Amino acid sequence: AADFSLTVLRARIALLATAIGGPDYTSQIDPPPYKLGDDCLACLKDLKRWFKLVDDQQKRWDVAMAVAEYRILTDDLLPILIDWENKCSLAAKLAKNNPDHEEFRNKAYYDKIALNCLQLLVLMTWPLIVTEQSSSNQITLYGELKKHQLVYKKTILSMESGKVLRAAIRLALDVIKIDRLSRTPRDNMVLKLVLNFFRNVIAIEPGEFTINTKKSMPKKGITSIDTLPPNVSMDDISLNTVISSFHKNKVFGFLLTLTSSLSKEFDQDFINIPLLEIMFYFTKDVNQELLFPTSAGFELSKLLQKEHQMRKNVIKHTSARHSRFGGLLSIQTPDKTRLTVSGSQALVDEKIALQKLDDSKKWNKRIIKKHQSVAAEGLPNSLLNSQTGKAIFFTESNGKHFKEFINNFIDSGFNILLHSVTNYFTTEQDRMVTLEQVEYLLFFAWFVKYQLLRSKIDNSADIKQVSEALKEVTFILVSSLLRSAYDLKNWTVTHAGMIAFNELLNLVSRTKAAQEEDSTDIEFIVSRLFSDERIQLLSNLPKIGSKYSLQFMKSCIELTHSVLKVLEQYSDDKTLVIIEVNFQKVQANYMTEPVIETYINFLERFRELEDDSIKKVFSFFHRVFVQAKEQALLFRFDLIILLREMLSPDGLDRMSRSRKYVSQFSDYFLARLKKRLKKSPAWFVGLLFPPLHNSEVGFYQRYGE
């Protein structure tokens, strides 16, 4: 019965689809226009009722799949919408040419039809989130719906050079034309609909590969994780295409006008969240480094030169003769026993022989990494879970347009938008959902970082455009959200708040450096953000970060470095008072075994790391080693192995900037360790096991006296 019911539903939906309309192949004109059926609006209303009754109330998604299967969106709605746009364009042309000319028979009917198609399209492009309460049917139809939405996005951005965006903009103009005091709630509904349409268009991204885990991993393993439709490639739905289409249709101007006039020509409740989410999605994956630096030839030559060096280093480990040439080495250890190692290269170098003996071992100790995807908690892909280095590549024109748009927005209305959002969500702190918190914090952090970079690069711009960043209310809101996240153990929002706090610290330090005299007002804000509870929380943050994702640890490193820098600056400049704050005690709070463990675990992935991160980790290492003289903390063995791996010819690039810091820190650590070992023979065994916590010998163990 259920299968028969599904078949009947599919047949009814198909019959409705055929009744919407079709191209007028009969007409001689053969850019075939899409003629409308006599009851087209009836079919639109019927589809709206279908969605309402089935998709939402019955907790099903078969209706959406049936609609997608028959190419309703790509073959019907886009035709009528684009034809309506074209008809309005001709009408405007005639009106401008002659005011008396009026050929728009059934104008009201056309506008109602266009609004209905826009609402239907918005309904069909809503984000899909999988939750624990979702039905099994809601779960089994996730990948198919995601692929259908990807196809929808491609068609939207490609069909007629994306004139759908122009039609939506035209609807927005029609709405705004009427006066503010004359605006009814329906106009605000239409504006919200347009903003949601833009957000949906920007947000659609490829899904995720979910696999059952009832039984063990087969020895065949995973072959591929590709989750794209048949006809859609990555570049079609890339952000570059979105930017190009938006510029071609003059979409950025509409958003600029909407944000500039906010609080002067529009209400705030139907405006704040839409634009805020749109702009969070706009910079969800963008990295500010790319924005501010043929060039491609020079970069290619540099990369080829790096690959050549890597190849040269690899060649040193390969045998001149073929694999089956033979040759067995017998290396005798001091206790009159010899182990056999094969390979030609092992004969000449002892290090290679030992390394091969190591690799030949089969048993591997466990490593358990329990990680939850963002989709599990209903969050989109962003900097939180993306790679530290994943960069979206832009063409020159698209990048220039993106830079211009962001610069104009920041210069125009960032402060007003931030003020409105922060006030609204201070009024409504309690019912915040993780998605909104993460989005708001990420938007704040990204824009503050971009403004900081722009100020650093050039002095023509101003640093006051982010004045609301230092405003007290935003700081209290951010601190409250971070504290609540820490209390409730919500690590995603915790990471977002960590990034936001890092950005706020960078901003405060930069503004104090720029103008110290006016910093007296700034001195008020710093006193608030270094409360005893806040200091304890920041100190504890690195400790827990060891057993989490790499990005969380990177944010921990960033936040710790910024906090230390700001605290040192303020302590040196004047007497810091929240209780007088001395740099010594706060530094001591930061010297603990878990902190060093977290740092070592972070530096274990130096191959994928950037120069700045390496510089910062080694700066903290220098601080711990020298400033406080706690060398006992770093007298571990993982550090020695990591140092040798990084200084090895096959490790970190020799002709690299970080290698200078690595070599200096090594030299110093080796010298101090040799001195201590000569003084204290017992440390020969202490290098392996963790330090004691015994009162009788703890002092001697740590300080050696």
Binding site: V8, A11, A14, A17, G22, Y25, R71
Partner: protein, 301 residues
């Protein structure tokens, strides 16, 4: 009213709403519309004189107890262009629907004809597009193609299963009926009754067979460019078509150009290549049909 019983119009058929032609045709409503239109074309087509060509053709078919109703492609194109286009693009499903419609039309004239024959195959006679064994490419796969060549091989006539019925070896359950494609054998990798991946076997001694023959079609020596190797394919002739040609004949074959996975070819060449063969739908000899044939009128001359 049952939604599945609703029928579209003729124009709506041209407006296709589906990923592929086969998906569009397979839909219930479109299938019913196609059946109705094909029946109307068969029952209402008239030539210059106004004589119902296909009525007389069906009467003659019944007279000889034949199971083939020859249909002119040009007539279908002139009457309903969209149906001709669908038949060209998706021959298998259109031909299935056409066979059902033709069996209904034949039963219209001879009510009890089902006793003599249960299936009346429909054969397309004059395909406007003529191809050669050299110009066949991947784009022609799974579509009606007309080719010319000379027969240089032929095999004997054998019976082949038309509906198979498998069984299990772990539980002994018997699977349902299936349709045996002429190019690939039926494969089952999981049961439904015991729902186990165990071995299987062919059972159900009750089965309905069909004739099967294979010939090798080669390009005409004259058509081959100067001193180039001729190209050959293998043609499969099903029931009602076996023993219709013998080696050393020039023939024109209209059929479906199909492909299937062959392990031997992949192992040999070293790339994922698929074997290809033509499932014949009609064979003709190569004015008219034969000069030597004469008529009663000529015999008087």
């Amino acid at each position: 009213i049952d939604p599945l019983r609703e029928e579209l119009t003729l124009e709506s058929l041209s407006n296709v709403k589906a990923n592929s032609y086969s998906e569009w045709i397979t839909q219930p409503n479109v299938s019913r519309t196609i059946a109705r239109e094909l029946k109307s074309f068969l029952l209402e087509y008239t030539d210059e004189t106004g004589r119902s060509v296909y009525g007389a053709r069906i009467r003659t078919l019944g007279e000889m107890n034949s199971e083939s109703l020859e249909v002119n492609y040009r007539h279908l194109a002139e009457s309903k262009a969209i149906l001709a286009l669908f038949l060209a693009k998706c021959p298998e499903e259109m031909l299935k629907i056409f066979d059902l419609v033709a069996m209904e039309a034949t039963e219209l004239h001879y009510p009890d004809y089902a006793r003599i024959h249960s299936e009346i195959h429909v054969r397309i006679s004059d395909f406007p597009t003529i191809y050669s064994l050299r110009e066949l490419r991947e784009s022609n796969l799974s579509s009606l193609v007309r080719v010319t060549g000379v027969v240089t091989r032929r095999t004997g006539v054998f019976p082949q299963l038309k509906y198979v019925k498998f069984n299990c070896l772990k539980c002994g359950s018997i699977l349902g009926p299936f349709f045996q494609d002429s190019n690939e054998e039926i494969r089952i990798s999981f049961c439904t009754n015991c729902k186990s991946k165990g071995p299987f076997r062919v059972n159900g001694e009750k089965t309905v067979y069909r004739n099967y023959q294979r010939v090798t079609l080669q390009e005409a020596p004259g058509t081959v460019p100067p001193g180039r190797l001729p190209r050959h394919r293998e043609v499969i002739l099903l029931a009602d078509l076996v023993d219709v040609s013998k080696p050393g004949e020039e023939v024109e074959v209209t059929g479906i150009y199909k492909n299937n996975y062959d392990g031997n070819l992949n192992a040999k060449n070293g790339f994922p290549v698929f074997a290809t063969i033509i499932e014949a739908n009609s064979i003709k000899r190569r004015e008219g049909l034969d000069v030597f044939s004469w008529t009663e009128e000529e015999e008087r001359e």
